[PDB]
Amino acid sequence: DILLTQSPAILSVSPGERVSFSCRASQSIGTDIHWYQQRTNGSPRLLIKYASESISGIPSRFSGSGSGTDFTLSINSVESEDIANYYCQQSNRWPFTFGSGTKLEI
Amino acid sequence: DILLTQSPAILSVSPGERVSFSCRASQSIGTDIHWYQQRTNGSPRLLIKYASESISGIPSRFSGSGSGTDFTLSINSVESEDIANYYCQQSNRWPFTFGSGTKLEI
Amino acid sequence: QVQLQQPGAELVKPGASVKLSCKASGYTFTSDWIHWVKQRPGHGLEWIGEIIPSYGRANYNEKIQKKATLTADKSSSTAFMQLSSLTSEDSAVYYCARERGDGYFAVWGAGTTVTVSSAKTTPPSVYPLAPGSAAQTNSMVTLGCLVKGYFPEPVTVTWNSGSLSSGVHTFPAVLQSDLYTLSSSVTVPSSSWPSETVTCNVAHPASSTKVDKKIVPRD
Amino acid sequence: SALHWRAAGAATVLLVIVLLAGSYLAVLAERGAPGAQLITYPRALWWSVATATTVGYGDLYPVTLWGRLVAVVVMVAGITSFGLVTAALATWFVGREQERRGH
Amino acid sequence: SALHWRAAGAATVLLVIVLLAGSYLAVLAERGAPGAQLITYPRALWWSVATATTVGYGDLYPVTLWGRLVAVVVMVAGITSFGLVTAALATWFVGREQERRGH
Ligand code: NA
Ligand code: NA
């Protein structure tokens, strides 16, 4: 079971700035990681698959970085619509595991 | 020689609750680990073989979790008969080694 | 189009069992995996299980107690989750997700808000909220409607059947004596109302009730 | 279209099916075992290719019984194929050597 | 029931015995060496299968002399078998090519 650790818990940033959410795995997992956005009352939404690869429909502001244990989700020009919880999810070994989550605040 | 570490030493819990004993190995051992129950004056009794696999005759309350270095033994609805020392034992590399032990208290 | 469909809410008595459904349209391959995720109020996401519908083999999270048992109907493309002997710790939103067998869960379900309590199902009481004749307005006018006396969560509130969306706040419910209570507000240009009709749509899936109420000025 | 050339083509065609089925079966067998790495179809595919060519990379190997049985089937099919090509090649060269000496 | 088909079957039968004995012997040789991984029978079995197919996974390999001698015996038996099948296959194809030209 891979332990994922998202630090810090709550992240506050200025509007229009760049932001970065970090997710660290308990052991090396390559690039087998996926990011999800979840707003209030809504269901989880896939942002970035396999560390860096982008999903169509997702804003070009979102971009993924990192390999091994250190992984980063970054947003350029943070706007109101980005206020949400953010989750990292690994797929390297069974079973699949999620991070604790990181809340974005503007 | 694989070092096994059982934290904490003494574990106290309410009756009917879920409990969890952790056993950490000095290095990655996969799933090659086994749990034993030993009451007062009695001899060791096998609970869970190979991390999760159950032995017949053993209560369905007992279930094993974990892979790599982090391993967990869990009991649902802890009752009087469960008060004992609990030992984890690895079989990944020679020689076989035991944990320090964890005593359950109600 | 919406791929995965789940019932909104499910009420269960403590100790009793419940089956949760999840049907899927669109591309439904043989290689597809339907997972189930648990989310407690104000908590993170928790993987519970997975099942391949074409073969029926299921896998469960052994870290937490195996409360669930997964089955799937082939002809209807629907996956099921049988949960039994539920406590207050089981009161959570349960999602189902489609995984192409390549790690990520591409499309998610709405979620089933399961509440474990002995109390009975109560339909909501919807009352409109119009500004008092004493109070004035400017360029914008704020309206609303009250939702009270219902059990359990949740309720879906939209304005003019969801067509009106910009400037709407739906406040979280408060629990008092086995009954929830919340409010939703809407801010429209002063010129529009009430010459143009404004109506909040409240849906309560647990009682299978949907009610509408048009906002009209006080006498 | 001689036997050995027919058989080699059949072996190559068969191998690809064994690879594809092998990837699919690996995933279905491995999922459920804690720590299992062969849990995604594209990963299992390249695992199969490696395994069919008798190549192993690190700890990229099945942990379950059936998963390891799949591995055996993949391996055998792999060796049989690349052994059958050699046999087919040998038959072609010996046939021409018979023509070379006018035999 | 020609020689090459008899010999291949004999090689395959023999290989399985070499595998089983090889698993058993590995465990008996490895236990005693500190850090040795080939200390359980089911593990040594799949080690043997890998080793017979000339596949090595990470550091899943014997550390003792006799353990490594067992490995040599397993390897040789493995290659001999899958070399004998090819030889048997080649004999079958060349025989049919002789029939193909009416020779
Ligand atoms: Na090799
Ligand atoms: Na290797």
Side-chain angles (χ1 to χ4, degrees):
Chain A
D1 305 62
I2 318 286
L3 173 72
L4 265 44
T5 321
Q6 303 198 234
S7 185
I10 313 152
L11 199 55
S12 300
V13 75
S14 304
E17 278 198 333
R18 191 191 168 96
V19 84
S20 299
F21 319 100
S22 67
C23 169
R24 198 180 290 190
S26 55
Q27 55 176 306
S28 182
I29 57 160
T31 50
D32 305 346
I33 198 156
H34 320 287
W35 291 92
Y36 300 90
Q37 188 196 48
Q38 196 197 29
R39 293 181 189 91
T40 318
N41 290 317
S43 57
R45 172 79 181 265
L46 181 57
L47 281 170
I48 299 295
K49 70 172 190 168
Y50 296 115
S52 60
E53 303 183 68
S54 301
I55 317 294
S56 55
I58 295 303
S60 57
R61 302 178 294 114
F62 289 86
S63 54
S65 314
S67 68
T69 56
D70 293 352
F71 298 94
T72 327
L73 181 73
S74 300
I75 316 167
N76 286 60
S77 183
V78 176
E79 49 169 302
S80 304
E81 61 181 36
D82 303 304
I83 302 160
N85 284 117
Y86 291 88
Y87 292 94
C88 61
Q89 169 261 302
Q90 68 80 42
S91 54
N92 193 71
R93 297 175 196 267
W94 197 90
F96 307 107
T97 43
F98 291 92
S100 56
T102 305
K103 185 68 189 288
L104 184 66
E105 189 195 314
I106 298 173
Chain B
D1 305 62
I2 318 286
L3 173 72
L4 265 44
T5 321
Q6 303 198 234
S7 185
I10 313 152
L11 199 55
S12 300
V13 75
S14 304
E17 278 198 333
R18 191 191 168 96
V19 84
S20 299
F21 319 100
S22 67
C23 169
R24 198 180 290 190
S26 55
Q27 55 176 306
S28 182
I29 57 160
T31 50
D32 305 346
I33 198 156
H34 320 287
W35 291 92
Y36 300 90
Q37 188 196 48
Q38 196 197 29
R39 293 181 189 91
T40 318
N41 290 317
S43 57
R45 172 79 181 265
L46 181 57
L47 281 170
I48 299 295
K49 70 172 190 168
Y50 296 115
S52 60
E53 303 183 68
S54 301
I55 317 294
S56 55
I58 295 303
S60 57
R61 302 178 294 114
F62 289 86
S63 54
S65 314
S67 68
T69 56
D70 293 352
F71 298 94
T72 327
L73 181 73
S74 300
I75 316 167
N76 286 60
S77 183
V78 176
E79 49 169 302
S80 304
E81 61 181 36
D82 303 304
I83 302 160
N85 284 117
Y86 291 88
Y87 292 94
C88 61
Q89 169 261 302
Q90 68 80 42
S91 54
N92 193 71
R93 297 175 196 267
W94 197 90
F96 307 107
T97 43
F98 291 92
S100 56
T102 305
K103 185 68 189 288
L104 184 66
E105 189 195 314
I106 298 173
Chain C
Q1 71 282 351
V2 175
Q3 309 286 307
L4 274 61
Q5 289 166 206
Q6 301 190 77
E10 284 281 327
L11 182 69
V12 199
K13 287 184 179 292
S17 62
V18 69
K19 185 175 271 188
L20 304 174
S21 52
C22 177
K23 62 154 74 78
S25 65
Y27 291 104
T28 54
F29 297 104
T30 176
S31 60
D32 292 354
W33 285 90
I34 300 292
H35 299 248
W36 295 86
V37 190
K38 181 182 180 177
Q39 191 167 49
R40 297 181 78 183
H43 275 249
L45 296 156
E46 193 177 38
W47 184 86
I48 327 153
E50 59 184 324
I51 183 165
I52 184 155
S54 47
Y55 302 96
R57 188 161 189 168
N59 311 313
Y60 311 92
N61 192 23
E62 296 154 33
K63 291 184 84 176
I64 56 160
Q65 179 47 242
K66 192 198 160 182
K67 303 261 192 170
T69 315
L70 306 184
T71 46
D73 184 281
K74 274 264 83 272
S75 58
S76 60
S77 299
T78 315
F80 305 97
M81 180 157 76
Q82 170 66 34
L83 284 151
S84 57
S85 297
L86 305 171
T87 51
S88 57
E89 300 153 42
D90 291 289
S91 300
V93 183
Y94 294 95
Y95 301 92
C96 66
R98 179 193 285 167
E99 190 244 348
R100 297 293 184 196
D102 58 346
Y104 53 83
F105 318 108
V107 63
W108 294 69
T112 311
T113 318
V114 181
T115 322
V116 186
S117 181
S118 303
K120 61 94 183 287
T121 318
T122 323
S125 298
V126 183
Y127 307 111
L129 299 161
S133 303
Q136 72 279 128
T137 185
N138 46 61
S139 63
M140 303 296 286
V141 60
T142 312
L143 314 158
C145 60
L146 168 73
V147 185
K148 71 162 288 172
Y150 71 95
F151 188 85
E153 283 272 58
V155 282
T156 318
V157 187
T158 56
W159 292 85
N160 291 309
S161 297
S163 66
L164 200 58
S165 181
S166 198
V168 174
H169 317 289
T170 316
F171 299 87
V174 287
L175 185 72
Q176 194 180 30
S177 304
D178 298 51
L179 292 168
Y180 293 99
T181 299
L182 62 73
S183 300
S184 183
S185 68
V186 63
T187 312
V188 288
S190 191
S191 58
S192 62
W193 190 84
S195 56
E196 294 152 38
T197 175
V198 175
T199 304
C200 65
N201 323 66
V202 184
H204 191 261
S207 62
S208 297
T209 54
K210 193 179 181 180
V211 282
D212 299 295
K213 204 72 80 70
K214 188 199 170 184
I215 314 298
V216 284
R218 289 183 63 86
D219 54 65
Chain D
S1 190
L3 176 74
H4 49 102
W5 294 126
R6 281 200 65 167
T12 317
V13 163
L14 205 71
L15 181 68
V16 180
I17 312 158
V18 178
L19 285 153
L20 288 169
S23 313
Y24 198 90
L25 285 163
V27 176
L28 263 75
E30 293 287 288
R31 284 197 183 186
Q37 287 187 309
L38 300 73
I39 54 164
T40 48
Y41 302 116
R43 196 72 46 78
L45 178 69
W46 297 115
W47 165 81
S48 308
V49 177
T51 315
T53 48
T54 69
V55 191
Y57 290 100
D59 60 348
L60 212 300
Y61 74 117
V63 289
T64 61
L65 175 74
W66 308 102
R68 283 167 184 184
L69 288 181
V70 167
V72 169
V73 170
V74 169
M75 276 181 272
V76 169
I79 299 166
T80 306
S81 296
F82 295 113
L84 215 147
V85 173
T86 309
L89 282 167
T91 315
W92 179 46
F93 289 137
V94 173
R96 294 281 183 172
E97 188 67 27
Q98 203 173 30
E99 300 177 65
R100 180 189 165 270
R101 295 174 202 173
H103 194 82
Chain E
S1 190
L3 176 74
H4 49 102
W5 294 126
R6 281 200 65 167
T12 317
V13 163
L14 205 71
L15 181 68
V16 180
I17 312 158
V18 178
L19 285 153
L20 288 169
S23 313
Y24 198 90
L25 285 163
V27 176
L28 263 75
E30 293 287 288
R31 284 197 183 186
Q37 287 187 309
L38 300 73
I39 54 164
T40 48
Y41 302 116
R43 196 72 46 78
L45 178 69
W46 297 115
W47 165 81
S48 308
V49 177
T51 315
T53 48
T54 69
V55 191
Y57 290 100
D59 60 348
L60 212 300
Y61 74 117
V63 289
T64 61
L65 175 74
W66 308 102
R68 283 167 184 184
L69 288 181
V70 167
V72 169
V73 170
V74 169
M75 276 181 272
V76 169
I79 299 166
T80 306
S81 296
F82 295 113
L84 215 147
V85 173
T86 309
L89 282 167
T91 315
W92 179 46
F93 289 137
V94 173
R96 294 281 183 172
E97 188 67 27
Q98 203 173 30
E99 300 177 65
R100 180 189 165 270
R101 295 174 202 173
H103 194 82

